[PDB]
């Protein structure tokens, strides 16, 4: 994890080879590209409470918001086992408005 | 590790805290405290200096 020590990018893994009186290291590293922009927000009000990401951020694609994993973009609907409750929502700078679906209750109809 | 990607400073710093084992909404609700405290510690540096 220490950056840049075994190439550029998030390192993969590494494969060695000699040299005469050396080593050659081949470095495999993940490398991100074609990276779209979207608007975003630190949490989510709901029934007066702020809602944060488990893991992600949440993103708008100009009218709808989702979580993602913040390395890779795959959007997911926001739930209460995509995130967490902390307080209420009159502390957080640049809260937003949304729902936040339950599965169990539209389960018991 | 690429091509820079903008993300809200804020919202970076929650990333940081994360990375040693504190919840984000920590520093969410106290984003003034802990703003003014790197001020006064950035301008504690030049005054030694
Ligand atoms: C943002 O993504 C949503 C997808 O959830 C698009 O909204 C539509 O949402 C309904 C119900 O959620 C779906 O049945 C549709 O298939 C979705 N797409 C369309 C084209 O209707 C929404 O269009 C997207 N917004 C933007 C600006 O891209
Ligand atoms: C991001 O910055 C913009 C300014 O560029 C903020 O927009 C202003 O919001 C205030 C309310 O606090 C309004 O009175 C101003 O009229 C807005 N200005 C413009 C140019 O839109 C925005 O609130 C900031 N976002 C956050 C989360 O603080
Ligand atoms: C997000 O939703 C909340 C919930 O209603 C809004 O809070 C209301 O805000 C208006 C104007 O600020 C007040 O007149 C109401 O009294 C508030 N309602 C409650 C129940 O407190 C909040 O304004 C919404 N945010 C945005 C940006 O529209
Ligand atoms: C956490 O520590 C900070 C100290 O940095 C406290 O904030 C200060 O509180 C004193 C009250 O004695 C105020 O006079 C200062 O102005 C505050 N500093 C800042 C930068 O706001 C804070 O109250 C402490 N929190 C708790 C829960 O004890
Ligand atoms: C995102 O939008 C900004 C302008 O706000 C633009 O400069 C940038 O090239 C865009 N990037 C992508 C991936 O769309």
């Not at chain 1, 009000?45 to 893991?55: I, L, T």
């Not at chain 1, 795959?74 to 967490?84: C, S, W, Y």
């Not at chain 2, 106290?30 to 030049?46: E, R, T």
Request: glycine residues 8%; charged residues 15%.
């Amino acid at each position: 994890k220490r950056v840049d020590f075994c190439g550029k990018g998030y390192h993969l893994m590494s494969f060695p080879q000699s040299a005469p009186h050396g080593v050659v290291f081949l470095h495999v590293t993940y490398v991100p590209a074609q990276e779209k922009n979207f608007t975003t927000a630190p949490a989510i009000c709901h029934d007066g409470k702020a809602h944060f990401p488990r893991e992600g951020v949440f993103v708008s694609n100009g009218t709808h918001w989702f979580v993602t994993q913040r390395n890779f973009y795959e959007p997911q609907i926001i739930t209460t086992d995509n995130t967490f409750v902390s307080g209420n929502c009159d502390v957080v700078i640049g809260i937003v408005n949304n729902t936040v679906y339950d599965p169990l209750q539209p389960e018991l109809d | 590790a690429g091509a820079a990607l903008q993300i809200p400073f804020a919202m970076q710093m929650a990333y940081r805290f994360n990375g040693i084992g504190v919840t984000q909404n920590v520093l969410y609700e106290n984003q003034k405290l802990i703003a003014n405290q790197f001020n006064s510690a950035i301008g504690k540096i030049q005054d030694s200096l």
